[model samples]
Target: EYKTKVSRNSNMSKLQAGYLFPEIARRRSAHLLKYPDAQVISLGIGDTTEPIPEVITSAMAKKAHELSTIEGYSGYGAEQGAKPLRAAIAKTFYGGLGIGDDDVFVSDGAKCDISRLQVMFGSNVTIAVQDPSYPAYVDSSVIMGQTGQFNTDVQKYGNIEYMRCTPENGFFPDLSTVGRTDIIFFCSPNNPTGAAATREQLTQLVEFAKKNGSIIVYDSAYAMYMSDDNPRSIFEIPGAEEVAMETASFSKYAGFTGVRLGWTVIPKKLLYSDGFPVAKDFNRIICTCFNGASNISQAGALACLTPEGLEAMHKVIGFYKENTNIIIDTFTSLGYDVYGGKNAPYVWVHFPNQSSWDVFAEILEKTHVVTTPGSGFGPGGEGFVRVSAFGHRENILEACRRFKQLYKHHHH
Candidate 1:
């Protein structure tokens, strides 16, 4: 009658009271319980409300049918990724940038690859993230025991560096003052903020990473959303192959959120302090933990790179970008200080001097529209809210109207 020798992973207990989304959802449910008849329009979650292009879906259906035949039956694909899929991804995203298929390791999606990357990195090193960035980078860091206890006062962890990318600094942290860490998680057209960095900014980031000997885990999940000259992949920067690896997704690009396909590129030139190649160890991690991305998903993902499929995806992206325009127009017309939604799908709106959660509640209460509290991203995100542009056109239009309604009802 004794407990097992093991206790829970202390790291799990160390997590914040609640993960960000759950808290938002909890509040949403509470609001619904109070106002049962409310026609709540949630622009809170990051998801695609679009169907996969027929070309891609047909490829998947073909692959699915093939599996039914004995001659075509196959199991246990290459753990790293099938050659054709990896090659297709590399050709489409990193072509002419000197990266090849061998450098690409496919996974279920960017989210899982990020976790697998953490597994590859282990807990021995320190890390940093952009403030008002994706929550996973910081949350995963905490889980790996790479950070000290969370500081309630500062709303940050002791060892991790939160490089503030607020509008005050042009949305790129002052790298000179950031010092150094073993790893830096950077997202372009960043989550929550939706600000895509310029080529100059990305070059500076690469140089900073090289100077500090830090490996930049660059997340390019929203690269395709950019309608500007911004470099889509870190590999475009001259020295990035030595200092950065990229994680990109089919989630937004091809509406593959549930279909789940993404890849991570680990350059062979990237090395540890001892000058050993990093990709070798990453390969080991892939083989050890991941069997492979789903073969069916791989079929669809490969099809996504075809000329016709690429055009279909761009049309989808354009639709979302148009939605961004509508959202930005609505917010700006209300006299709100809005940043982003031009080169990205999120419109970061600032209601200065007000708590973001309160703003979130205000919108929900007044307009029955759900927005994500910016503070949930990080301390720098206070006084702001992120409005997603990934819903049906009619729903987005309805939410925009409600946003205007909320504005009209408030103030003076």
Candidate 2:
């Protein structure tokens, strides 16, 4: 007979209760129950409501048919990714950035890739993440024993450095205070805050990483939301190839949340602690752990890179862009301090004389519109709220109208 063990990892115990999105869902459900008749418009979570494009669907269907026949059955795909998908990704996503096909490694999603990739580094590494970040970055690091105790005062993990992306810096991570960090996580067209970094700022980060031998985990999942030609990949910056690892998702860009497919780009030039090769180790780790993304999902993602598929993706992006306009214009006219929703799909709004959670509660009760409380993002995110623009045009317009009516009645 064996005695049962009761102890748990101490680091796991220090993690906060429930990730941000689920908490938002709990509140949303409560709101619906209270005001059943209210036409609730959600600008909280950045989930696309659009259907998969016909071109992508057709390609997936064809592949499914092929898998049934003797001519085209594949038992297991290359852990790094299939060659066709990899080549298409390299040409279309990173072709202009000077990155090749081998640099790309297809995965389930950017979120999962970012979390898993962090595990490769030693626990002694000092992690730094942007304030008002996607939460997944810091949270994953915390779970991996690479962080200090949670500090309630600053609303952050103690050992880790916090790159404050405050209003003073236009929500861009202020890297000056982040000296000697081992790894840095950055998100462009940021989550819960639509702030996209300028090319100059990204270049600055790349230079820092190169000088310090630090690994920069760049999240470009929302890059497609940018209407401007603002360096979609971090590889666009000179010297970035050696210092940065980028992850992207098709959930927002290609309507594949249900399909579950994405990829990461790890350049062969990247090095480990002892200056040994890193790419080969990464490939081995991936091969040992991941069976590979689903065949159907890979087929769907491959279609997304085709000319016809690109056109369909463009239309879907256009729809979200229109929704973003509704949010930006409405908030601006109401005289609220708003950030994002121009080149990106989220609108970060600063509330007057109210905490972020308080604002979230008010908006939910009064207008029945769901929004994310910025305080949950980090200390620097207090007194603000994040509104997403991933809904239909009609729903977005209705949300804007509701906001205007609520403000008019409540403020004056």
**Could you say which candidate leads in TM-score?**
1
Supply candidate 2's per-residue lDDT for 288.
80
Q: Model 1: which ten-residue window has the lowest total lDDT?
A: 403-412
Error of 1 at 41 (Å): 1.5
For 229-290, candidate 2 gives per-residue lDDT tens digits of: 68888998988888888999889987787788989888878887788766776787788867
Give lDDT for model 2.
Answer: 0.84
TM per prediction:
0.97, 0.95
Model 1 spans > 4 angstroms off: 1-3, 409-412
Judge candidate 1 against the unseen true structure and give its global Cα lDDT, from 0 to 1: 0.90
Question: Using alpha carbons, what is the TM-score of model 1?
Answer: 0.97
**What value does the lDDT take at residue 72 in candidate 1?**
72
